[PDB]
Symmetry: C2
Subunit: 217 residues, 2 copies
């Protein structure tokens, strides 16, 4: 079973070029380590970029995008050249990999998460630069790790201190106890892509609790 | 139609007394303006405190808590003393208001959100100090405002600079364009409770877009 990483990132490209370059490098590092990609299914912005590079290196079978029925297209213009039996027009498989269309957002999040959770070692969630939606996704999978539903690691790919405020908040919440001790390390940050993939490979759920409790049992 | 505010906050009390006191004050201000409460349910932490004060001032009909079947109790104990026909044991109605039990988390979030959305003017979402789950809820309703699903305002009740890192991130994301212009103001912060209620009452969805586009028609 190959490792699978779900990348949460913006539909937009981002003001600084550093975000797009970070998307490229993340794609390159994931492809180099034979890690399959799970993502929102966009062809634009960081999403489209990661999908594009990963698919460029390792083919369509390497990338899986999950799209709700609401965001489906019914006419074959531009990047969308692949047509399903039901006449839904979807992003080009050769350029952006396989895509599944699900009815609602709920089963979409559930499917992406499920694919990551059932992946081999090194499988994890990565949050690249993004807006409100990627944040909701990241905190969702974080909450799921906290509830003991899954043991996969969660890494924030921090480009030019983009995620700094959130890490700051995590620290504050930890200090205030709203995040319980041993749960502060569910999410980790990385300066670069290799850092992030490495973080996902290294991650152990019981590690923080072990460090906390072992000397006292 | 009375105004309804859904308050998102941690099950834990918080290290500093300021968070709990803030829960009390929010309860008092909400009760004074005849604003009904929607919340996670339970009797412990900020949730329990807000529910407790609001119900203390304005009675059971004033508070609605929504609880998943998993968090139901089947035997009477402590704060949980009210038994439904189906023999589910729920927090005391006289102390903590009415509570509805739903199957899963999804329909729970949808129900709380629904109750806010169909409320009268001044209805809103408030994020008091909380962990990962409340964060996911807040960014969820923010995303829903962004998609045009609802026109209600979202306010972070900032206790001792608890939410500061998040506001910082919102500014950074706005600057980087991952939060589109006119969407940075979907969420606003408040130092005190009256501030928050005021913010929810004042909020207008098209305002930012108006400021952005009116000059360009």
């Amino acid at each position: 079973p190959r490792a699978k990483i779900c990348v949460f990132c913006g539909s937009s490209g981002g003001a600084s070029p550093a975000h797009m370059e970070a998307a490229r490098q993340l794609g390159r590092v994931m492809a180099e380590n034979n890690i399959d990609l799970v993502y929102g299914g966009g062809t634009v912005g960081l999403m489209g970029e990661v999908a594009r590079t990963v698919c460029s290196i390792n083919g369509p079978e390497s990338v899986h995008g999950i799209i709700p029925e609401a965001l489906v297209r019914y006419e074959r213009d531009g990047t969308y050249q692949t047509v399903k039996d039901n006449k839904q027009v979807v992003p080009t498989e050769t350029v952006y990999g396989r895509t599944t269309v699900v009815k609602d957002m709920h089963t979409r999040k559930k499917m992406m998460a499920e694919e990551v959770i059932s992946g081999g070692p090194g499988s994890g969630f990565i949050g690249l630069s993004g807006g409100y939606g990627t944040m909701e996704e990241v905190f969702e999978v974080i909450t799921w790790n906290q509830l003991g539903i899954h043991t996969k690691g969660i890494c924030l790919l921090n480009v030019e201190g983009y995620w700094d405020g959130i890490l700051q908040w995590i620290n504050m919440a930890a200090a205030q106890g709203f995040v319980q001790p041993g749960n502060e390390t569910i999410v980790v940050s990385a300066g670069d892509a290799e850092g992030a993939v490495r973080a996902l490979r290294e991650y152990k759920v019981s590690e923080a609790t072990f460090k906390l409790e072992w000397g006292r049992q």
